[PDB]
Amino acid sequence: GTVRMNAPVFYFAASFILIFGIIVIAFPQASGAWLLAAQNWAANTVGWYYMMVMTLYLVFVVVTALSGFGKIKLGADHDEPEFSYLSWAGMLFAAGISITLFFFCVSEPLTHLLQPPQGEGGTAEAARQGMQLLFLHWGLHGWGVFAFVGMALAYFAYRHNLPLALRSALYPLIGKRINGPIGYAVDGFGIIATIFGLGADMGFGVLHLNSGLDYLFGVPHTQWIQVGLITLMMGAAILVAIAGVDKGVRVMSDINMLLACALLLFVLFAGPTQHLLNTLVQNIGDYLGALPSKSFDVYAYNKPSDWLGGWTVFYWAWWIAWAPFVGLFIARISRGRTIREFVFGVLLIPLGFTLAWMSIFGNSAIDQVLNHGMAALGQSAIDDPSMTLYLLLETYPWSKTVIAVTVFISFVFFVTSADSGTVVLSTLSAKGGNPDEDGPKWLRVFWGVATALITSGLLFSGSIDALKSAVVLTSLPFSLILLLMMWGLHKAFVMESQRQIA
Amino acid sequence: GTVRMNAPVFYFAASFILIFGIIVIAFPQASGAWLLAAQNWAANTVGWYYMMVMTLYLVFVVVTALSGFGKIKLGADHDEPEFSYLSWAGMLFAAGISITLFFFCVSEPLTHLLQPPQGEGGTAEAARQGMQLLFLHWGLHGWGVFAFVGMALAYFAYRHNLPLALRSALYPLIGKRINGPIGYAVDGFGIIATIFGLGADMGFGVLHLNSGLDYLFGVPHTQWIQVGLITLMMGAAILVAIAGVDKGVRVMSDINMLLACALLLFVLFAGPTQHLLNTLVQNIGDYLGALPSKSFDVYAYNKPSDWLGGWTVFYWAWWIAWAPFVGLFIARISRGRTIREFVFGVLLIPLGFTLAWMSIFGNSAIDQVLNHGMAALGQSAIDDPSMTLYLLLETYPWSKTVIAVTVFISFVFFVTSADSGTVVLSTLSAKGGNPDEDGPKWLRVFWGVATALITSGLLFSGSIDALKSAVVLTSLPFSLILLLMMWGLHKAFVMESQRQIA
Amino acid sequence: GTVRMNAPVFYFAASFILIFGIIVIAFPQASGAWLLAAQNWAANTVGWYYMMVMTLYLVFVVVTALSGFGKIKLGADHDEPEFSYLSWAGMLFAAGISITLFFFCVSEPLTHLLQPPQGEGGTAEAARQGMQLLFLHWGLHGWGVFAFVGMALAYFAYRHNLPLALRSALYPLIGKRINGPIGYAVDGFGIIATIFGLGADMGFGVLHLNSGLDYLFGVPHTQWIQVGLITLMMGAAILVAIAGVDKGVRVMSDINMLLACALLLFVLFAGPTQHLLNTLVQNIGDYLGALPSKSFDVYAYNKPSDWLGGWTVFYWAWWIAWAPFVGLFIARISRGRTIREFVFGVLLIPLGFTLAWMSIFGNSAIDQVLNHGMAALGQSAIDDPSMTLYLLLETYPWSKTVIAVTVFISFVFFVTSADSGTVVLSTLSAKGGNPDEDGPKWLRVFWGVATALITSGLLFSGSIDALKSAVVLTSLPFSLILLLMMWGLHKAFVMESQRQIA
Ligand SMILES: C[N+](C)(C)CCO
Ligand SMILES: C[N+](C)(C)CCO
Ligand SMILES: C[N+](C)(C)CCO
């Protein structure tokens, strides 16, 4: 009949989050020690497992699209797409990228130059290796799991007339038991990872936004200021989701996506243009040359440390935690397309903007720390990673206008990403109605207030190292579910191949 | 009618072996000098040729299986396989691996660390490079020639109704002349290589077995002890081949293959587990990253030496010499399968166990020579490579029980490999009867006593450097025959492509 | 009706060349400074663009031949080839290779050893890196653009019944407007690049030929001697083109192509044969291992210099400038073949001879500068690159006969390449008649005298650095036309794919 709540999933997913969020708020000092102890345990005990499973998804989705299965339509064999490609291409940006592109664009390459994982720092191979780790952390591996989840969700819904849910890919394995205890756990385990990923993103955004106001006006860094920042950021995203406007939203996304390109072009043409163009091509070459061996590097013959638990394993856990939300969002606007076209669009359209942004913005700061002798900019990336971007931007013409534009652009990016997150969260916990509409409207408020509570709890207990620990701990049970879904999809493809010739 | 002897092949193959084996036994001092002189000549004169031809086989078999020819059945287009995959897979282990997996697992990586082919020894890149040479010597190159010979033998026998012989792949080139002087030389040249490969394997096994008894009881290393060891090892394998039991044999193989995994798991869980898991993933990454360039490395710009004639060219000659026996064994249990399924089973099922064994066992010893300061273990790999495994195993709990189990497991491995070798040897020199049965039973005894004689002659004249020289010298005329067979197979595939469209 | 002149193309292409050629002859001192200033500007401003576009052509032609489009015939689906493969294979040599193979074979690897682009010179990694740059500069990248132009020209002429011209590949974009102002500029811009490439080749040939006569007889290096050398070289190639003989020409080509192999075998067997064979395999391995990363190397993190504008960007501009002449020559003898067969013949038949020549001749000189202490041979590659080959050849048996043979072979190579250039140049500026015949005979004389004038002007103003600058400056507007042609070909392939299933 009508849409409603799926109680076995809601209660399971909501009793974990609300119990975790109170222990961290009532005991901030005991929680920051245990989360710091678990982060060093994970890097040494389950570090190889993440590196092993992140490559399987990419190899699977590439081999599938290059083979003869890339001819299968994502609907019936005679229906057509519903969007202009232009409107398809632009809807991937709004959901994929967020405010954390401003937090890591300058301070992360300056950290790998002064403290490399192997070698001696401050030289010319440290820079070449740091701009390569930066391409690895934002490249094909991350966009390859989004495409996997999206393809698996669209295939079982538009060809087999099954619900749009994570458990439908287990149908070739257990049949009608996707409506029992086994299928409800798969759906409850996929909400916890999403909540923790969104919380980490929102916490990094609060930290980035608190420094711009300090630079411009003089607002202090206080615990009661961050509460108001969280309130503003989340109340501006709940009221856009419960208001039922999509024209103004998708029209405002595109405006922000043009201002982003204007800012990128200003930064490119107001600096060393030829140096930046040369380093762009150099970085592309280095990444493609070292890809097949950097996928398994764990620095096993060096002296033991905990570098891996804060940089690469964190990134693999973070992309896995964001996969359920972006996959179900891209599956809804891809009916009528073939597998090859879908995969090669998702892998290459949002990646070219991200890698260009990262290259230009990181090389602009490396060039000024190495060649112009600006050491207070590189020392800031270690003690205060939230102020490095403004220290770089204050060396440009009309510096107090570019910063005021950057603050606004960054706020709008976060709003247009959180607004789409709450809708998908309310859909993953509903049941019934038409298989093209979203869940009830009282669940968006609930799943927004829950994320606000989690973020508030995790920042006031350990800052940046607590978010990275919670994500790595909570993304573990969903990787095995992804492997099971891969098995089910492979088992469906063989019945496809037999049925086309028999 | 009935099976019988193929006299033109038997006399040609038996007059070379019996004449070679008496000269070495009657003149042990003059034979050890000439075999040592030939080993340094070969490494410099025909070293590039082996590296050039070993890559052709692998590229051929991979491109064939990835193309549209991978759809062709290895029988008629409507018959089905005869085995359970489980029993097909387990039968590849029994024939492929032997007792020499215990002789090289610990002492070879410890040799590449203290005496690298390029660089300075005892450091942390010497270990990373040695564990990469070890993966190259036991990886895809060796299992890629087995698959080539097996596919070529099954194709011409189950689709064109030709004999199961090495000369049938020359039919598209010379027609009915495979039953004349040209086809008999091709079959006689393939028995000599097999005999010398088996002799080298048996000699390394005698050396490995003589040290365990010294460690346990106190048996000396004497020339009259090795004669009794050879007698026991070969008399235990002739009586299993002339007795006509396959249930008890294939059932005892599987028992030994479970004890091997139990021993591997004990060694993994009784040591530094996390270090070993990390180094496993690191080794996989390093091998896959350096594969396309290490295929042609001959160290040509360095100072001249003879490193290549004892390590890499020896391994290429040894795999080529073992190809005729394993190919005809795997061709008999693969009727009804497609080319792609056969190739991707043979390349990946027996390789994962071998590479895991090598990685775990080599890293366990590198970790204890570098980090725990055990120099008498690394000095033993240079002066006495037969005692290094026991020196490593004596640092574990209950050390005198694990060694007594290892000795037994190693003896059973050799027996289940030699038993299958003699049957195929008696088949390669027979003619007539049904094309699913084996040759007469008086030829198994003959080809076993011949191998015993060759091994006895080669050990008492130069020990380990004489076996490596004889193999490299006697595997030269069979590589050209393999190239001719590749030409014939390519010429048959084009007549396949037309007939499917005309 | 009959063939005639295409005046809008002729006047456009002939007013640029004749105006450029007089300014350089009337002002030799002011022209050598501006051409030297432009060479350093280009290396820094448009260096990344050439590296970016040269890889697109290769990736396009490889992916096209490996896909299902490699089955399309280059004519009608039922006609057969017209040549014997033997006469097809041999006609690619005569047009592809020229006299500049003798100018760079010895002096270029000796320059990269003593002045590497990165590192320290005179050691054993400088040699390994120089023999790798030499393989990059004469390998797959250059032969991959020839195949692209040839395939694009044959496809639109033998399947769609369009003229054999460069503008026919713009038909899917603008239709009947290929016979107006847009199509005439595309054809006029393709003659200027060809003229400048031919001029550079002829200038290097004059320099190489002037030193052999100095060595043999004692002819000085004078400005009035080079005028006579140019007169002889070009008058011997106009009289072969206006005489109408192809049997004697294609028959004399094959004779020269046998003398070349005889000379290569003499040089291989009169020196260190085993060292040379080992280094050949080593070079193949190094090139294939470093190919996917050396395609984007611009040395961006090193100290700024102008190395790129004289070595790699010059080579990319030179191959692009030679593409229009060789593409239209190979398109005329390839009717009836499939795309895959054409591409894999062009990529692999002329490349194996070139890479073997380069390897043997460069390693013969590296081995004698490093190991035998011959420093006057390596100092000559810096101050006088035209005399290095004779200094190397004078250390062989019967040295005054090999040099007299080399001079003749080099002269005949240039003649058989220029003779075919003038015919294609007269065809690119004609219109009418049968689409299998060549243009009028008064245009061959014109386009030969024009090249002579350009060469005379560019050598008397800056020698070797002026040719390299003119080529890099004049090959810029044709790369964009090549991109447009790629777009048109892709747009035609999709109408192929739809029409085979509908
Ligand atoms: C926030 N992540 C980096 C995980 C994904 C961005 O789209
Ligand atoms: C003994 N070889 C290494 C040659 C083959 C093992 O299957
Ligand atoms: C002269 N180039 C090197 C440009 C081409 C030779 O065929």
Side-chain angles (χ1 to χ4, degrees), chain A residues 41 66 107 113 133 185 211 225 230-231 248 272 277 326 375 417 420 430 467 475 478 490 498 501:
Chain A
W41 174 89
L66 285 188
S107 55
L113 165 79
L133 289 164
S211 294
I225 306 287
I230 286 173
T231 302
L277 287 163
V326 177
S417 186
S420 314
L467 310 158
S475 293
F478 191 62
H490 164 78
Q498 292 168 355
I501 67 170

PDB file of all heavy atoms in Angstrom, chain A residues 41 66 107 113 133 185 211 225 230-231 248 272 277 326 375 417 420 430 467 475 478 490 498 501:
ATOM      1  N   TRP A  41      46.039  -0.541  16.549  1.00  0.00           N
ATOM      2  CA  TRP A  41      45.791  -1.970  16.396  1.00  0.00           C
ATOM      3  C   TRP A  41      45.336  -2.302  14.981  1.00  0.00           C
ATOM      4  O   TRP A  41      45.808  -3.279  14.384  1.00  0.00           O
ATOM      5  CB  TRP A  41      44.752  -2.426  17.419  1.00  0.00           C
ATOM      6  CG  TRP A  41      44.316  -3.849  17.256  1.00  0.00           C
ATOM      7  CD1 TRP A  41      44.890  -4.950  17.815  1.00  0.00           C
ATOM      8  CD2 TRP A  41      43.209  -4.325  16.483  1.00  0.00           C
ATOM      9  NE1 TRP A  41      44.213  -6.081  17.437  1.00  0.00           N
ATOM     10  CE2 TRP A  41      43.176  -5.725  16.618  1.00  0.00           C
ATOM     11  CE3 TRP A  41      42.242  -3.703  15.688  1.00  0.00           C
ATOM     12  CZ2 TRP A  41      42.217  -6.511  15.990  1.00  0.00           C
ATOM     13  CZ3 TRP A  41      41.293  -4.486  15.063  1.00  0.00           C
ATOM     14  CH2 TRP A  41      41.287  -5.874  15.219  1.00  0.00           C
ATOM     15  N   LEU A  66      34.585  -4.366 -20.085  1.00  0.00           N
ATOM     16  CA  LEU A  66      35.340  -4.663 -21.294  1.00  0.00           C
ATOM     17  C   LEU A  66      34.912  -5.944 -21.997  1.00  0.00           C
ATOM     18  O   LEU A  66      35.312  -6.154 -23.146  1.00  0.00           O
ATOM     19  CB  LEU A  66      36.843  -4.755 -20.990  1.00  0.00           C
ATOM     20  CG  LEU A  66      37.597  -3.448 -20.753  1.00  0.00           C
ATOM     21  CD1 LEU A  66      39.082  -3.723 -20.654  1.00  0.00           C
ATOM     22  CD2 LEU A  66      37.311  -2.446 -21.851  1.00  0.00           C
ATOM     23  N   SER A 107      46.958  21.038   2.441  1.00  0.00           N
ATOM     24  CA  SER A 107      47.690  20.621   3.633  1.00  0.00           C
ATOM     25  C   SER A 107      48.182  19.181   3.547  1.00  0.00           C
ATOM     26  O   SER A 107      49.111  18.811   4.269  1.00  0.00           O
ATOM     27  CB  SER A 107      46.821  20.797   4.876  1.00  0.00           C
ATOM     28  OG  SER A 107      45.594  20.107   4.746  1.00  0.00           O
ATOM     29  N   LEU A 113      55.576  15.900   2.017  1.00  0.00           N
ATOM     30  CA  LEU A 113      56.868  16.427   1.597  1.00  0.00           C
ATOM     31  C   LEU A 113      57.831  16.542   2.772  1.00  0.00           C
ATOM     32  O   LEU A 113      59.019  16.240   2.634  1.00  0.00           O
ATOM     33  CB  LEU A 113      56.676  17.785   0.917  1.00  0.00           C
ATOM     34  CG  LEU A 113      57.884  18.697   0.690  1.00  0.00           C
ATOM     35  CD1 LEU A 113      58.690  18.250  -0.511  1.00  0.00           C
ATOM     36  CD2 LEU A 113      57.439  20.132   0.516  1.00  0.00           C
ATOM     37  N   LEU A 133      50.991   9.927  -4.117  1.00  0.00           N
ATOM     38  CA  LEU A 133      50.060   9.484  -3.085  1.00  0.00           C
ATOM     39  C   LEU A 133      48.750  10.259  -3.146  1.00  0.00           C
ATOM     40  O   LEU A 133      47.678   9.681  -2.926  1.00  0.00           O
ATOM     41  CB  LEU A 133      50.696   9.632  -1.705  1.00  0.00           C
ATOM     42  CG  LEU A 133      51.829   8.668  -1.363  1.00  0.00           C
ATOM     43  CD1 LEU A 133      52.605   9.164  -0.164  1.00  0.00           C
ATOM     44  CD2 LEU A 133      51.277   7.284  -1.111  1.00  0.00           C
ATOM     45  N   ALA A 185      19.593  -7.732   8.272  1.00  0.00           N
ATOM     46  CA  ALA A 185      20.919  -7.404   8.781  1.00  0.00           C
ATOM     47  C   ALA A 185      21.779  -6.738   7.715  1.00  0.00           C
ATOM     48  O   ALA A 185      22.545  -5.819   8.021  1.00  0.00           O
ATOM     49  CB  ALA A 185      21.600  -8.663   9.309  1.00  0.00           C
ATOM     50  N   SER A 211      37.952  28.402  10.703  1.00  0.00           N
ATOM     51  CA  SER A 211      39.162  29.182  10.467  1.00  0.00           C
ATOM     52  C   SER A 211      38.952  30.372   9.544  1.00  0.00           C
ATOM     53  O   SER A 211      39.625  31.393   9.711  1.00  0.00           O
ATOM     54  CB  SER A 211      40.263  28.294   9.885  1.00  0.00           C
ATOM     55  OG  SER A 211      40.683  27.326  10.824  1.00  0.00           O
ATOM     56  N   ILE A 225      31.120  27.654  19.991  1.00  0.00           N
ATOM     57  CA  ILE A 225      31.016  28.142  18.621  1.00  0.00           C
ATOM     58  C   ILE A 225      30.782  26.995  17.647  1.00  0.00           C
ATOM     59  O   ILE A 225      30.019  27.132  16.685  1.00  0.00           O
ATOM     60  CB  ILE A 225      32.283  28.941  18.254  1.00  0.00           C
ATOM     61  CG1 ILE A 225      32.535  30.048  19.276  1.00  0.00           C
ATOM     62  CG2 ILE A 225      32.172  29.526  16.858  1.00  0.00           C
ATOM     63  CD1 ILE A 225      31.580  31.203  19.178  1.00  0.00           C
ATOM     64  N   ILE A 230      27.530  23.621  13.850  1.00  0.00           N
ATOM     65  CA  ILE A 230      26.845  22.370  13.529  1.00  0.00           C
ATOM     66  C   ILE A 230      25.349  22.608  13.366  1.00  0.00           C
ATOM     67  O   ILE A 230      24.721  22.095  12.429  1.00  0.00           O
ATOM     68  CB  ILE A 230      27.133  21.316  14.615  1.00  0.00           C
ATOM     69  CG1 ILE A 230      28.560  20.787  14.490  1.00  0.00           C
ATOM     70  CG2 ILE A 230      26.147  20.173  14.534  1.00  0.00           C
ATOM     71  CD1 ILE A 230      28.966  19.878  15.622  1.00  0.00           C
ATOM     72  N   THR A 231      24.756  23.377  14.282  1.00  0.00           N
ATOM     73  CA  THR A 231      23.335  23.693  14.187  1.00  0.00           C
ATOM     74  C   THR A 231      23.004  24.361  12.861  1.00  0.00           C
ATOM     75  O   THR A 231      22.059  23.958  12.176  1.00  0.00           O
ATOM     76  CB  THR A 231      22.917  24.592  15.348  1.00  0.00           C
ATOM     77  OG1 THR A 231      23.215  23.945  16.589  1.00  0.00           O
ATOM     78  CG2 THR A 231      21.433  24.887  15.279  1.00  0.00           C
ATOM     79  N   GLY A 248      14.825  24.334  -8.045  1.00  0.00           N
ATOM     80  CA  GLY A 248      15.711  25.306  -7.431  1.00  0.00           C
ATOM     81  C   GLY A 248      16.985  24.708  -6.878  1.00  0.00           C
ATOM     82  O   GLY A 248      18.019  25.386  -6.854  1.00  0.00           O
ATOM     83  N   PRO A 272      52.084  30.620 -11.614  1.00  0.00           N
ATOM     84  CA  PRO A 272      53.046  30.128 -12.611  1.00  0.00           C
ATOM     85  C   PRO A 272      52.426  29.148 -13.594  1.00  0.00           C
ATOM     86  O   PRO A 272      52.503  27.935 -13.388  1.00  0.00           O
ATOM     87  CB  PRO A 272      54.124  29.448 -11.756  1.00  0.00           C
ATOM     88  CG  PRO A 272      53.770  29.739 -10.325  1.00  0.00           C
ATOM     89  CD  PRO A 272      52.318  30.028 -10.290  1.00  0.00           C
ATOM     90  N   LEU A 277      51.149  23.624 -15.820  1.00  0.00           N
ATOM     91  CA  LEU A 277      50.781  22.746 -16.927  1.00  0.00           C
ATOM     92  C   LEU A 277      51.761  21.588 -17.081  1.00  0.00           C
ATOM     93  O   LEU A 277      51.344  20.436 -17.286  1.00  0.00           O
ATOM     94  CB  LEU A 277      50.688  23.553 -18.218  1.00  0.00           C
ATOM     95  CG  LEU A 277      49.473  24.475 -18.321  1.00  0.00           C
ATOM     96  CD1 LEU A 277      49.673  25.514 -19.398  1.00  0.00           C
ATOM     97  CD2 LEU A 277      48.217  23.677 -18.579  1.00  0.00           C
ATOM     98  N   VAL A 326      25.938   6.978  -2.513  1.00  0.00           N
ATOM     99  CA  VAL A 326      26.119   7.452  -3.882  1.00  0.00           C
ATOM    100  C   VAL A 326      25.659   6.407  -4.897  1.00  0.00           C
ATOM    101  O   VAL A 326      25.159   6.760  -5.975  1.00  0.00           O
ATOM    102  CB  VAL A 326      27.585   7.859  -4.106  1.00  0.00           C
ATOM    103  CG1 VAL A 326      27.819   8.285  -5.543  1.00  0.00           C
ATOM    104  CG2 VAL A 326      27.973   8.977  -3.158  1.00  0.00           C
ATOM    105  N   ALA A 375      58.636  28.974   4.855  1.00  0.00           N
ATOM    106  CA  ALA A 375      58.643  27.830   5.761  1.00  0.00           C
ATOM    107  C   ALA A 375      57.496  27.879   6.761  1.00  0.00           C
ATOM    108  O   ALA A 375      57.088  26.834   7.284  1.00  0.00           O
ATOM    109  CB  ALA A 375      59.980  27.758   6.494  1.00  0.00           C
ATOM    110  N   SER A 417      25.323  18.367  -0.647  1.00  0.00           N
ATOM    111  CA  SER A 417      25.607  16.951  -0.420  1.00  0.00           C
ATOM    112  C   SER A 417      24.812  16.336   0.727  1.00  0.00           C
ATOM    113  O   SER A 417      24.295  15.220   0.570  1.00  0.00           O
ATOM    114  CB  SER A 417      27.103  16.744  -0.166  1.00  0.00           C
ATOM    115  OG  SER A 417      27.419  15.368  -0.081  1.00  0.00           O
ATOM    116  N   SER A 420      20.952  15.556  -0.154  1.00  0.00           N
ATOM    117  CA  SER A 420      20.723  14.307  -0.863  1.00  0.00           C
ATOM    118  C   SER A 420      21.008  13.084  -0.005  1.00  0.00           C
ATOM    119  O   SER A 420      20.458  12.015  -0.283  1.00  0.00           O
ATOM    120  CB  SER A 420      21.576  14.256  -2.131  1.00  0.00           C
ATOM    121  OG  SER A 420      21.502  15.474  -2.845  1.00  0.00           O
ATOM    122  N   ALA A 430      12.643   2.300   4.523  1.00  0.00           N
ATOM    123  CA  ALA A 430      11.216   2.292   4.245  1.00  0.00           C
ATOM    124  C   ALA A 430      10.837   1.041   3.460  1.00  0.00           C
ATOM    125  O   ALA A 430      11.687   0.248   3.053  1.00  0.00           O
ATOM    126  CB  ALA A 430      10.809   3.550   3.476  1.00  0.00           C
ATOM    127  N   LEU A 467      37.648  10.757  14.436  1.00  0.00           N
ATOM    128  CA  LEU A 467      36.851  10.513  13.238  1.00  0.00           C
ATOM    129  C   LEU A 467      37.469   9.421  12.375  1.00  0.00           C
ATOM    130  O   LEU A 467      36.769   8.499  11.925  1.00  0.00           O
ATOM    131  CB  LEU A 467      36.707  11.811  12.440  1.00  0.00           C
ATOM    132  CG  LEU A 467      36.257  13.076  13.181  1.00  0.00           C
ATOM    133  CD1 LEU A 467      36.672  14.332  12.434  1.00  0.00           C
ATOM    134  CD2 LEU A 467      34.759  13.076  13.407  1.00  0.00           C
ATOM    135  N   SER A 475      33.514   0.449   9.229  1.00  0.00           N
ATOM    136  CA  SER A 475      33.360  -0.024   7.857  1.00  0.00           C
ATOM    137  C   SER A 475      33.773  -1.484   7.656  1.00  0.00           C
ATOM    138  O   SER A 475      33.862  -1.928   6.510  1.00  0.00           O
ATOM    139  CB  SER A 475      34.141   0.866   6.891  1.00  0.00           C
ATOM    140  OG  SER A 475      33.581   2.160   6.824  1.00  0.00           O
ATOM    141  N   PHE A 478      30.797  -4.338   6.345  1.00  0.00           N
ATOM    142  CA  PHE A 478      30.132  -4.104   5.067  1.00  0.00           C
ATOM    143  C   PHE A 478      30.961  -4.585   3.878  1.00  0.00           C
ATOM    144  O   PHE A 478      30.404  -4.864   2.806  1.00  0.00           O
ATOM    145  CB  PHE A 478      29.796  -2.618   4.927  1.00  0.00           C
ATOM    146  CG  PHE A 478      28.876  -2.306   3.785  1.00  0.00           C
ATOM    147  CD1 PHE A 478      27.597  -2.829   3.743  1.00  0.00           C
ATOM    148  CD2 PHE A 478      29.292  -1.491   2.750  1.00  0.00           C
ATOM    149  CE1 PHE A 478      26.756  -2.547   2.686  1.00  0.00           C
ATOM    150  CE2 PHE A 478      28.457  -1.210   1.693  1.00  0.00           C
ATOM    151  CZ  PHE A 478      27.188  -1.738   1.660  1.00  0.00           C
ATOM    152  N   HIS A 490      27.806 -12.340 -10.139  1.00  0.00           N
ATOM    153  CA  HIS A 490      28.444 -13.305 -11.029  1.00  0.00           C
ATOM    154  C   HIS A 490      27.531 -14.490 -11.302  1.00  0.00           C
ATOM    155  O   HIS A 490      27.485 -14.999 -12.426  1.00  0.00           O
ATOM    156  CB  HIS A 490      29.769 -13.784 -10.442  1.00  0.00           C
ATOM    157  CG  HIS A 490      30.295 -15.028 -11.086  1.00  0.00           C
ATOM    158  ND1 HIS A 490      30.937 -15.020 -12.306  1.00  0.00           N
ATOM    159  CD2 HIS A 490      30.268 -16.320 -10.684  1.00  0.00           C
ATOM    160  CE1 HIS A 490      31.285 -16.253 -12.624  1.00  0.00           C
ATOM    161  NE2 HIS A 490      30.891 -17.060 -11.658  1.00  0.00           N
ATOM    162  N   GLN A 498      23.612 -18.130 -20.746  1.00  0.00           N
ATOM    163  CA  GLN A 498      22.934 -19.315 -21.258  1.00  0.00           C
ATOM    164  C   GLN A 498      21.629 -18.974 -21.958  1.00  0.00           C
ATOM    165  O   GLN A 498      21.316 -19.560 -23.000  1.00  0.00           O
ATOM    166  CB  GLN A 498      22.648 -20.301 -20.125  1.00  0.00           C
ATOM    167  CG  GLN A 498      23.875 -20.951 -19.529  1.00  0.00           C
ATOM    168  CD  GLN A 498      23.565 -21.678 -18.238  1.00  0.00           C
ATOM    169  OE1 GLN A 498      22.446 -21.616 -17.730  1.00  0.00           O
ATOM    170  NE2 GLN A 498      24.559 -22.369 -17.696  1.00  0.00           N
ATOM    171  N   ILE A 501      21.590 -17.810 -25.747  1.00  0.00           N
ATOM    172  CA  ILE A 501      21.877 -18.785 -26.793  1.00  0.00           C
ATOM    173  C   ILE A 501      20.984 -20.014 -26.722  1.00  0.00           C
ATOM    174  O   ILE A 501      21.037 -20.849 -27.637  1.00  0.00           O
ATOM    175  CB  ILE A 501      23.359 -19.216 -26.779  1.00  0.00           C
ATOM    176  CG1 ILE A 501      23.678 -20.003 -25.508  1.00  0.00           C
ATOM    177  CG2 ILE A 501      24.264 -18.005 -26.900  1.00  0.00           C
ATOM    178  CD1 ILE A 501      25.038 -20.654 -25.530  1.00  0.00           C
TER     179      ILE A 501
END
